[PDB]
């Protein structure tokens, strides 16, 4: 696959509908902990242990401590130059009547904080809740999300469970509900929102240029989306830190931090 | 617990 920035820029200059698939690497360049992969732990657990319906069923306080920590951590994190290049791209192209959409698995909203408006968050958001009784989804940026979680969620091994009674965990504020809230994030073993998948398909079907950023095109989630773009003859450009593009078929591979390559690519 |  080509590494010619000048050739990519020629496609970019003509593209009227860009899909940008954004993976964990974009968030990692902002220092956002993912609690996945080697070394990434919260206390003695990884996300595979806590981001599950079973974990929440048995230990909702521990799961809420985990997500509370991750919410509060965001107060010290900022979008990186990759987020900014992507947002600035959307803004500039939008004034020209050209579409940019970001499809991200990241749940930390740094794309939104950078100014991205056209955003499909396929794994949901740390800053949305869903009521386990009535289903309502709500924005929630409160620090702390409930009083009982103030000062909880410390990540250090040895930290004991807060063991907050479920009545004092975040509760639904719809009139006449009061049900127990969960984070509006996709957990292991769960379905994506079919409505989001429908929106994703529409974008993949109409785009004339696809970028895969901060992840590989041959693993989830990009592997679910990029192949059918490439099948239509649409160029796919990969921006990630792998030395070997674990793939041919795709037109471009640019190695490096997205905050180094994307400002130039999307200028 | 898996890969999403
Ligand atoms: N991890 C995961 C969960 C759910 C999925 C569906 C609904 C389809 C898909 O695209 O791949 C999935 C992956
Ligand atoms: Zn409710």
């Amino acid at each position: 696959p080509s590494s010619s920035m000048a050739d990519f820029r020629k496609f970019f200059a003509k593209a009227k509908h860009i899909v940008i698939i954004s993976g964990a690497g974009v968030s990692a360049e902002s220092g956002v902990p993912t609690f996945r992969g080697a070394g990434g732990y919260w206390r003695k657990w990884q996300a595979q242990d806590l981001a599950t319906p079973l974990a929440f069923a048995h230990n909702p306080s521990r799961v809420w401590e985990f997500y509370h920590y991750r919410r509060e951590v965001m107060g010290s994190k900022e979008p990186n130059a990759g987020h900014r290049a992507i947002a600035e791209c959307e803004t500039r192209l939008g004034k020209q009547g050209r579409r940019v959409v970001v499809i991200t698995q990241n749940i930390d909203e740094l794309h939104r904080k950078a100014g991205t408006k056209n955003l499909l968050e396929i794994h949901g958001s740390l800053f949305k809740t869903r009521c386990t009784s009535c289903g309502v989804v709500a924005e929630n940026y409160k620090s702390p999300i409930c009083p009982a979680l103030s000062g909880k969620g410390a990540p250090e091994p040895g930290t004991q469970d807060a063991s907050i009674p479920v009545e004092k965990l975040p509760r639904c504020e719809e009139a006449g509900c009061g049900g127990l809230l969960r984070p509006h994030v996709v957990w292991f073993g769960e379905n994506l929102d079919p409505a989001i998948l429908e929106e994703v398909d529409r974008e993949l079907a109409h785009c004339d240029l696809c970028l895969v950023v901060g992840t590989s095109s041959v693993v989830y989630p990009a592997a679910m989306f990029a192949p059918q773009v490439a099948a239509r003859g649409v160029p796919v450009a990969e921006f990630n830190t792998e030395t070997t593009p674990a793939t041919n078929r795709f037109r471009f591979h640019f190695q490096g931090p997205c905050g180094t390559t994307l400002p130039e690519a999307l200028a | 617990s898996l890969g999403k």
Side-chain angles (χ1 to χ4, degrees):
Chain A
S2 170
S3 51
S4 169
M5 179 66 80
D7 289 344
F8 168 86
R9 299 272 296 156
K10 291 180 188 175
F11 283 111
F12 179 67
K14 298 197 340 300
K16 309 292 213 139
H17 187 161
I18 308 180
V19 167
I20 300 180
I21 299 163
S22 166
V26 184
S27 293
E29 294 181 34
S30 291
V32 175
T34 67
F35 309 96
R36 316 248 258 112
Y41 280 69
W42 179 85
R43 302 183 188 165
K44 62 182 78 174
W45 294 287
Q46 296 197 287
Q48 289 88 346
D49 303 307
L50 294 177
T52 74
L54 181 59
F56 188 76
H58 292 179
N59 271 92
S61 180
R62 181 188 297 158
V63 174
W64 263 118
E65 282 200 87
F66 178 55
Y67 282 100
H68 173 65
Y69 175 69
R70 299 174 67 186
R71 286 162 55 91
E72 299 302 310
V73 160
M74 292 310 299
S76 75
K77 306 294 175 179
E78 299 183 355
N80 63 64
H83 295 106
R84 291 196 310 269
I86 290 165
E88 293 162 8
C89 181
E90 181 181 355
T91 299
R92 186 180 67 254
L93 267 57
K95 291 172 191 158
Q96 305 166 1
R98 300 161 63 195
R99 178 163 181 92
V100 181
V101 59
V102 173
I103 303 171
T104 189
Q105 70 175 104
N106 303 319
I107 64 166
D108 54 53
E109 293 199 0
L110 286 172
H111 284 292
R112 296 200 170 280
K113 193 160 152 213
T116 293
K117 307 292 181 224
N118 197 11
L119 186 65
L120 293 172
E121 279 167 320
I122 67 165
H123 292 165
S125 164
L126 288 173
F127 301 109
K128 283 176 170 55
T129 56
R130 182 160 85 253
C131 182
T132 63
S133 289
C134 76
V136 172
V137 178
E139 283 186 3
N140 191 313
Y141 296 97
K142 300 182 201 173
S143 174
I145 184 162
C146 65
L149 281 163
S150 182
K152 307 304 183 179
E156 290 83 14
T159 303
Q160 302 305 291
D161 287 332
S163 301
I164 300 161
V166 289
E167 296 77 14
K168 288 173 168 41
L169 291 173
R171 307 305 296 210
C172 181
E173 290 179 77
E174 299 292 295
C177 187
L180 173 68
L181 304 182
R182 61 172 273 179
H184 183 64
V185 308
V186 177
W187 283 336
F188 291 100
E190 280 185 341
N191 199 13
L192 305 181
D193 180 347
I196 301 279
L197 283 183
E198 175 173 323
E199 293 193 35
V200 166
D201 226 53
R202 284 169 50 97
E203 304 294 325
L204 301 175
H206 292 93
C207 73
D208 58 5
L209 181 59
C210 178
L211 320 188
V212 176
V213 303
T215 187
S216 168
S217 203
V218 306
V219 304
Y220 174 93
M224 302 338 98
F225 307 144
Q228 57 256 59
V229 176
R232 310 164 39 217
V234 171
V236 180
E238 209 170 353
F239 296 77
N240 61 41
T241 54
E242 301 168 6
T243 76
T244 46
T247 177
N248 68 62
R249 201 209 304 196
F250 301 137
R251 204 82 44 94
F252 298 96
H253 182 263
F254 297 106
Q255 177 185 191
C258 298
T260 299
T261 55
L262 288 180
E264 178 170 0
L266 307 185
Chain B
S1 13
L2 205 301
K4 225 147 281 180

